[PDB]
Curated annotation (Swiss-Prot):
Residue stretches making up the Macro domain: 1-167
Source lineage: Viruses, Riboviria, Orthornavirae, Pisuviricota, Pisoniviricetes
Function according to Swiss-Prot or TrEMBL: Responsible for the cleavages located at the N-terminus of the replicase polyprotein. Participates together with nsp4 in the assembly of virally-induced cytoplasmic double-membrane vesicles necessary for viral replication. Antagonizes innate immune induction of type I interferon by blocking the phosphorylation, dimerization and subsequent nuclear translocation of host IRF3. Also prevents host NF-kappa-B signaling. In addition, PL-PRO possesses a deubiquitinating/deISGylating activity and processes both 'Lys-48'- and 'Lys-63'-linked polyubiquitin chains from cellular substrates.
Catalytic activity: Thiol-dependent hydrolysis of ester, thioester, amide, peptide and isopeptide bonds formed by the C-terminal Gly of ubiquitin (a 76-residue protein attached to proteins as an intracellular targeting signal)
Domain of life: Viruses
Subunit structure: May form homohexamers. Interacts with N protein.
Species this chain originates from: Severe acute respiratory syndrome coronavirus 2 (2019-nCoV)
Activity modulation comment: Inhibited in vitro by GRL-0617.
Membrane topology: Multi-pass membrane protein
Cellular localization per UniProt: Host endoplasmic reticulum membrane
Protein name: Papain-like protease nsp3
Length: 167
Protein backbone atom coordinates (compact mmCIF):
# COMPACT_ATOMS: atom_id res chain seq x y z
CA UNK A 1 0.00 0.00 0.00
CA UNK A 2 1.24 3.48 -0.96
CA UNK A 3 -0.09 7.04 -0.72
CA UNK A 4 -0.91 7.61 -4.41
CA UNK A 5 -4.58 8.59 -4.79
CA UNK A 6 -7.09 8.88 -7.61
CA UNK A 7 -5.23 6.83 -10.23
CA UNK A 8 -6.81 4.60 -12.85
CA UNK A 9 -5.19 1.15 -13.02
CA UNK A 10 -4.08 0.24 -16.54
CA UNK A 11 -2.19 -3.00 -15.80
CA UNK A 12 -0.75 -4.97 -12.91
CA UNK A 13 1.89 -2.26 -12.37
CA UNK A 14 0.96 0.90 -14.35
CA UNK A 15 -1.41 3.57 -13.04
CA UNK A 16 -2.44 6.87 -14.69
CA UNK A 17 -3.97 10.17 -13.57
CA UNK A 18 -4.73 13.66 -14.88
CA UNK A 19 -2.46 15.67 -12.61
CA UNK A 20 0.32 18.24 -12.47
CA UNK A 21 3.43 16.20 -11.59
CA UNK A 22 4.77 19.16 -9.59
CA UNK A 23 1.65 19.26 -7.41
CA UNK A 24 1.54 15.46 -7.21
CA UNK A 25 5.16 15.33 -6.04
CA UNK A 26 4.59 18.06 -3.45
CA UNK A 27 1.61 16.14 -2.04
CA UNK A 28 2.95 12.57 -2.11
CA UNK A 29 6.69 13.24 -1.59
CA UNK A 30 7.45 9.97 -3.40
CA UNK A 31 10.71 8.10 -3.10
CA UNK A 32 11.38 8.77 -6.80
CA UNK A 33 10.07 11.43 -9.16
CA UNK A 34 11.10 11.10 -12.80
CA UNK A 35 12.23 14.17 -14.71
CA UNK A 36 11.88 14.47 -18.49
CA UNK A 37 15.52 15.48 -18.83
CA UNK A 38 17.84 16.31 -21.71
CA UNK A 39 21.45 15.14 -21.92
CA UNK A 40 22.76 18.48 -20.60
CA UNK A 41 20.32 18.54 -17.67
CA UNK A 42 19.25 22.02 -18.79
CA UNK A 43 15.82 22.23 -17.17
CA UNK A 44 14.37 25.04 -19.23
CA UNK A 45 10.82 24.05 -20.09
CA UNK A 46 8.25 21.31 -20.12
CA UNK A 47 8.21 18.97 -17.14
CA UNK A 48 11.87 19.71 -16.40
CA UNK A 49 11.40 23.47 -16.31
CA UNK A 50 8.38 23.07 -14.02
CA UNK A 51 10.11 20.67 -11.60
CA UNK A 52 13.19 22.87 -11.44
CA UNK A 53 11.11 26.01 -10.78
CA UNK A 54 9.41 24.23 -7.87
CA UNK A 55 12.88 23.59 -6.35
CA UNK A 56 13.74 27.31 -6.55
CA UNK A 57 16.48 26.40 -9.11
CA UNK A 58 18.27 24.04 -6.69
CA UNK A 59 17.74 21.20 -9.18
CA UNK A 60 19.57 23.21 -11.86
CA UNK A 61 22.46 24.10 -9.53
CA UNK A 62 22.93 20.44 -8.59
CA UNK A 63 22.60 19.39 -12.23
CA UNK A 64 25.26 21.85 -13.43
CA UNK A 65 27.72 20.37 -10.93
CA UNK A 66 26.80 16.86 -12.11
CA UNK A 67 27.49 17.75 -15.76
CA UNK A 68 30.72 19.58 -14.92
CA UNK A 69 31.97 16.37 -13.27
CA UNK A 70 30.49 13.65 -15.50
CA UNK A 71 29.64 15.17 -18.87
CA UNK A 72 26.32 14.76 -20.66
CA UNK A 73 23.99 11.81 -20.31
CA UNK A 74 23.21 9.48 -23.21
CA UNK A 75 19.88 9.65 -25.00
CA UNK A 76 18.05 6.73 -23.39
CA UNK A 77 20.11 7.12 -20.20
CA UNK A 78 19.54 8.47 -16.72
CA UNK A 79 21.08 9.61 -13.48
CA UNK A 80 19.83 9.71 -9.90
CA UNK A 81 20.07 13.09 -8.16
CA UNK A 82 18.33 14.70 -5.21
CA UNK A 83 14.56 15.13 -5.20
CA UNK A 84 14.97 18.40 -3.25
CA UNK A 85 11.60 19.46 -1.75
CA UNK A 86 9.63 17.25 -4.16
CA UNK A 87 10.79 13.67 -3.52
CA UNK A 88 13.63 11.75 -1.93
CA UNK A 89 15.31 11.26 -5.33
CA UNK A 90 14.87 12.56 -8.85
CA UNK A 91 15.56 10.08 -11.66
CA UNK A 92 16.52 12.26 -14.63
CA UNK A 93 15.67 10.20 -17.74
CA UNK A 94 16.46 11.27 -21.30
CA UNK A 95 13.83 10.19 -23.79
CA UNK A 96 14.53 10.87 -27.46
CA UNK A 97 13.49 14.34 -28.63
CA UNK A 98 11.74 13.96 -31.98
CA UNK A 99 12.17 17.70 -32.59
CA UNK A 100 15.94 17.02 -32.58
CA UNK A 101 15.72 14.00 -34.91
CA UNK A 102 16.52 11.40 -32.25
CA UNK A 103 15.68 7.72 -32.73
CA UNK A 104 12.29 6.84 -31.24
CA UNK A 105 13.49 3.26 -30.62
CA UNK A 106 15.54 4.77 -27.77
CA UNK A 107 12.25 5.35 -25.94
CA UNK A 108 12.27 1.73 -24.77
CA UNK A 109 15.83 2.12 -23.45
CA UNK A 110 14.73 5.27 -21.61
CA UNK A 111 11.85 3.45 -19.89
CA UNK A 112 14.17 0.57 -18.89
CA UNK A 113 15.74 2.95 -16.37
CA UNK A 114 12.48 2.84 -14.40
CA UNK A 115 13.03 -0.87 -13.62
CA UNK A 116 15.85 0.05 -11.22
CA UNK A 117 13.27 1.57 -8.83
CA UNK A 118 10.43 -0.26 -7.11
CA UNK A 119 7.95 2.66 -7.27
CA UNK A 120 8.06 5.91 -9.30
CA UNK A 121 5.98 8.99 -10.04
CA UNK A 122 6.63 9.85 -13.68
CA UNK A 123 5.54 11.71 -16.81
CA UNK A 124 5.18 10.06 -20.19
CA UNK A 125 8.67 10.07 -21.69
CA UNK A 126 9.25 11.91 -24.97
CA UNK A 127 5.74 13.47 -24.77
CA UNK A 128 4.98 17.19 -24.69
CA UNK A 129 7.78 19.35 -26.08
CA UNK A 130 9.88 16.24 -26.85
CA UNK A 131 7.54 15.67 -29.81
CA UNK A 132 6.62 11.98 -29.61
CA UNK A 133 3.11 10.52 -29.80
CA UNK A 134 1.94 10.12 -26.17
CA UNK A 135 -0.22 7.11 -27.06
CA UNK A 136 2.95 5.43 -28.28
CA UNK A 137 4.86 6.49 -25.17
CA UNK A 138 2.20 4.93 -22.94
CA UNK A 139 2.34 1.69 -24.94
CA UNK A 140 6.13 1.50 -24.59
CA UNK A 141 5.83 2.26 -20.87
CA UNK A 142 3.34 -0.56 -20.29
CA UNK A 143 5.41 -3.00 -22.36
CA UNK A 144 8.77 -2.08 -20.75
CA UNK A 145 8.34 -1.02 -17.12
CA UNK A 146 7.83 -3.89 -14.67
CA UNK A 147 8.06 -1.88 -11.45
CA UNK A 148 5.17 0.19 -10.10
CA UNK A 149 4.76 3.41 -12.07
CA UNK A 150 2.29 6.22 -11.36
CA UNK A 151 1.93 8.38 -14.47
CA UNK A 152 0.87 12.02 -14.20
CA UNK A 153 -0.65 13.51 -17.36
CA UNK A 154 -0.99 17.30 -17.13
CA UNK A 155 -3.44 17.81 -20.02
CA UNK A 156 -6.98 16.63 -19.25
CA UNK A 157 -7.91 16.25 -22.92
CA UNK A 158 -4.83 14.10 -23.51
CA UNK A 159 -5.51 12.03 -20.39
CA UNK A 160 -9.01 11.15 -21.64
CA UNK A 161 -7.64 10.16 -25.06
CA UNK A 162 -4.96 7.94 -23.49
CA UNK A 163 -7.49 6.10 -21.33
CA UNK A 164 -10.16 5.74 -24.01
CA UNK A 165 -7.67 4.41 -26.57
CA UNK A 166 -5.76 2.11 -24.22
CA UNK A 167 -5.61 -1.50 -25.37
C1 LIG B 1 0.84 16.94 -23.62
C2 LIG B 1 1.83 18.06 -23.30
C3 LIG B 1 2.77 18.20 -24.49
C4 LIG B 1 1.01 19.37 -23.17
C5 LIG B 1 2.64 17.75 -21.99
C6 LIG B 1 3.75 18.74 -21.76
C7 LIG B 1 4.46 18.53 -20.44
N1 LIG B 1 4.28 17.25 -19.73
C8 LIG B 1 3.95 17.26 -18.31
N2 LIG B 1 3.46 16.11 -17.80
C9 LIG B 1 3.11 16.05 -16.48
N3 LIG B 1 3.21 17.02 -15.56
C10 LIG B 1 3.71 18.17 -16.08
N4 LIG B 1 3.91 19.33 -15.35
C11 LIG B 1 4.43 20.30 -16.19
C12 LIG B 1 4.56 19.75 -17.45
C13 LIG B 1 4.11 18.39 -17.43
C14 LIG B 1 3.95 16.06 -20.58
C15 LIG B 1 5.15 15.10 -20.72
O1 LIG B 1 4.60 13.83 -20.94
C16 LIG B 1 3.35 16.41 -21.96
Amino acid sequence: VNSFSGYLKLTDNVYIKNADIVEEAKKVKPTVVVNAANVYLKHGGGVAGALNKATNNAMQVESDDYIATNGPLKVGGSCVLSGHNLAKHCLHVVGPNVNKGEDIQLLKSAYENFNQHEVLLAPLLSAGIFGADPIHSLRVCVDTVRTNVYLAVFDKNLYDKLVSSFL
